[PDB]
Design a protein around this nucleic acid. Structure first.
Lengths: 131, 86, 61
RNA sequence: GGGAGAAGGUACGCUGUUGAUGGUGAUAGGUCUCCUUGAGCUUUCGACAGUCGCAGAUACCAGGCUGCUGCAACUG
RNA sequence: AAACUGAAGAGUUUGAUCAUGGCUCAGAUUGAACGCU
RNA sequence: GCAAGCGUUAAUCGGAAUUACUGGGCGUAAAGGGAGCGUAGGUGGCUCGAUAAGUCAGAUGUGAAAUCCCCGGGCUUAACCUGGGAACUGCAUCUGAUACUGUUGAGCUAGAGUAUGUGAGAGGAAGGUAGAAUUCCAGGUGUAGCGGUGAAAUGCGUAGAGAUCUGGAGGAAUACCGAUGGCGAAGGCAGCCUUCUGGCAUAAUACUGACACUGAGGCUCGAAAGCGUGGGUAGCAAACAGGAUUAGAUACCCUGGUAGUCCACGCCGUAAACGAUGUCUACUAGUCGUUGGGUCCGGACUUAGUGACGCAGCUAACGCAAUAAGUA
RNA sequence: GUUCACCACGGUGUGGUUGAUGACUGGGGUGAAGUCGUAACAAGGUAGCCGUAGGGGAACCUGCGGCUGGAUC
């Protein structure tokens, strides 16, 4: 079945932008919202709002962006998959596109960009590369 | 096979509440009765291989449910297999 | 070739044996000629090449 | 199933001490009876120590054993 | 102040092509041997 | 081109992403296990807590010296020597953080299951029976051919064949329906009927509450052929025999024909067991069929299968393309 | 000193593993202006291939089941 919730999230975004869809929706979660919130604040997606559904369920809707008719998120790949987790120190965070992209890092201070982790001098789980 | 009249009687004996019919105890009790009932069919038809694959499935399902109870509530497990003789 | 499959079996490359086993990893070996003959090469070309069969100090002939 | 007692090894007498154990059961305590204790007799196994001889299964008694191969399945 | 600098391919299967895939080569190294000097 | 050396051989790494961790592949180039169930193991939904093991950070101790690298200093330069650093990815012990993994308490329903009503089906096992047709046996009619082939011949027939009619025996398969139709995990499964029995599809409500996926070994099942024992034996037919064709013909064709094919119980465990495509998830233009449902108003929609096309994407190309060989 | 205990060498028997050799024998490969055929590639002149069984100087043939990686339809 589904065993990579984070990978499913990125795959939904990757396919939706490949299909030029206006928005992508999926069942919500705090981990999913935390990554989606970072994508908004990094400037890769327009917005991400959580709608509380019935039976204690929620839907996370993300509004995608396109620049000159091309998807803003050129590549969004998962680095720390469940079959092989990747934790890095403060000096071993791998950069994306020589600092242009974002390596989403899960630190003890929450989900944040790789440039933020180095500024805070903190490592964590490098969960994805988005460029 | 089990009829509706007796199938409802096993549920009424292993009830965890009001008309639940979904608890691990009632499911294992239903499978156990069904498995024992089919022992008569397979005694006369031992070459029946396509039906026997179905019997193994509920044997496998009953094992999964018993593993779940043993991990969930040990007392609910040791008591249940005492009644069912497993 | 998953991660779990690699930490169970693991990539095993194979080393090639020596193409000159008689030398026994030595640059040169001395030997005694037991036959000094001539022979013909393979298909494409023709000649009478000089060959000596020598018994080496390594026990190979 | 066997081959197989394959092959091949070690111990074995006597004396003293000592441990375990089966049987029978007198004397007692609670009627061809039952239960516990158990004297005497007896059984089968050990251990330790010493001792004599060339030799302890000491006499009589009591398998020799292996390798290849033909034949017939075998008991008869 | 610095220790933070690093990555080349070629030949060969075919009438020709692209791919696959082996073989070979150009580099560095040695407690070296041998040949000429 | 090197130069007091220069070549050759041996040897290691490289180039080789040619064992691919960084960093490869498996439709057809080598490569998906025949299919499934499942043990160890790997991995794993949502929400509120606890813990701090993993993870991260800090401090401390340690990580010998030499070597490597950096900044200098002495040999006339260099090799060499040398001072201080950096590094030695590590290990240990404390402290802090709690996003994720681990361990736990409680809760949730969206994955997975249960109860209840309908439905389709060559799903499986055991019995019974029906009608065509072939073969054989026995009679009636009848007479000179039948059969077979590209031609023939072997063969059958004047002891009466073949043809035709009427009876009887027996075995095997089930025309039409019949369908990129259906069911099954695969292998496979077609007359009709009864009995025992598995799964699936479907609307709604109720229930359990992550019970899940995959799975080394293991086990189960597993076409045909084949083997053992016991039955049966019509047709077909390995082997075998004969006739042809041919230079030959241990073949193709012809006439026969035994094992087998059938049944019961066991072995065997293999197939181009193929979609040459492991299983399970989620997402990604569309169009036209078709099977089993369901809900609406002859249409429309929605499901679970089964097909034909066709974007993006992928591919060496062929081609695949919601039943992916696309995106993970 | 004597004696007993432990013990090295050494001896005995019986197996296991493994190297070299061995009359003869099986397939594999290389080599020439060989002998016998022509099995495959075209529908290769009986479509080929897979599993299995029987047969045959030899490629191979035949039966049963399967596949298209079969042209002509």
């Amino acid at each position: 079945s589904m065993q990579d919730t984070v990978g499913d999230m990125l795959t939904r975004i990757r396919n939706a932008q490949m299909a030029n869809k206006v928005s992508v929706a999926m069942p919500s979660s705090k981990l999913r919202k935390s990554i989606a919130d970072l994508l908004v604040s990094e400037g890769y997606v327009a917005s991400a709002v959580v709608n509380a559904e019935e039976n204690n369920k929620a839907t996370l809707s993300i509004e995608l962006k396109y620049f000159e008719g091309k998807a803003v998120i050129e590549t969004i790949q998962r680095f720390s998959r469940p079959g092989l987790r990747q934790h890095r120190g403060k000096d071993a965070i791998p950069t994306v596109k020589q600092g242009m992209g974002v390596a989403i890092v899960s630190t003890s201070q929450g989900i944040m960009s790789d440039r933020a982790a180095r500024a805070a001098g903190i490592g964590g789980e490098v969960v994805a590369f988005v460029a | 096979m089990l009829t509706n009249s007796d199938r409802e009687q096993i549920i009424a004996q292993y009830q965890r509440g009001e008309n639940d019919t979904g608890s691990p105890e009632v499911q294992v009790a239903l499978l156990s009765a069904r498995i024992n009932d089919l022992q008569n069919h397979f005694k006369a038809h031992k070459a029946d291989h396509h039906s026997r694959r179905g019997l193994i499935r509920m044997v496998n399902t009953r094992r999964k449910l018993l593993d779940y109870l043993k991990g969930k509530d040990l007392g609910r497990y040791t008591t249940l297999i005492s009644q069912l003789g497993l | 070739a998953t991660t779990n499959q690699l930490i169970r079996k693991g990539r095993k490359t194979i080393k090639e044996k020596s193409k000159v086993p008689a030398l026994q990893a030595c640059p040169q070996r001395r030997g005694v000629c037991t036959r000094v003959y001539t022979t013909t090469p393979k298909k494409p070309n023709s000649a009478m090449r000089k060959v000596c069969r020598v018994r080496l100090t390594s026990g190979y002939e």
